[PDB]
Amino acid sequence: MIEDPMENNEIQSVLMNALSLQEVHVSGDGSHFQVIAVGELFDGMSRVKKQQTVYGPLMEYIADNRIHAVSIKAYTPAEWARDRKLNGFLEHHHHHH
């Protein structure tokens, strides 16, 4: 009484092992997928200090995952929509010096 294929469990296990929070979001398109960790713990941390301490653990796995583009960012639940509604996840690469 259970059947439904859907990977992304790898990045989920690595995301959780790296640093949980509450929820997970393995979004993407086809090649590059963004893994946003929902929760609150990292609700104030620096994007750098975050992605950093977040990459520290999932540094190797990704290093190899390089083959693709598995992004990661520990944010809130509303931070997502807002993020996706922003110009960073819905209009990244804007204005360059």
Side-chain angles (χ1 to χ4, degrees), residues 35-90:
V35 169
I36 254 164
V38 167
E40 243 191 288
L41 153 51
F42 282 140
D43 185 311
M45 244 87 168
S46 188
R47 190 180 111 272
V48 169
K49 227 257 191 126
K50 197 175 65 230
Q51 246 235 339
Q52 186 170 278
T53 285
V54 175
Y55 184 43
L58 75 94
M59 235 242 292
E60 256 266 295
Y61 219 89
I62 269 39
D64 218 302
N65 203 116
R66 186 192 244 288
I67 47 173
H68 322 320
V70 289
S71 273
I72 225 150
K73 238 133 137 168
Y75 284 133
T76 88
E79 180 75 318
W80 228 143
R82 184 191 225 280
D83 264 16
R84 228 136 111 274
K85 255 109 93 71
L86 261 192
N87 320 97
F89 271 91
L90 169 137

Side-chain angles (χ1 to χ4, degrees), residues 11-43:
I11 46 157
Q12 219 244 109
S13 189
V14 93
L15 167 79
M16 230 60 157
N17 275 301
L19 257 138
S20 329
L21 233 77
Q22 207 119 68
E23 245 108 62
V24 303
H25 277 81
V26 308
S27 209
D29 264 54
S31 314
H32 83 81
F33 332 94
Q34 139 74 244
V35 169
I36 254 164
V38 167
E40 243 191 288
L41 153 51
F42 282 140
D43 185 311

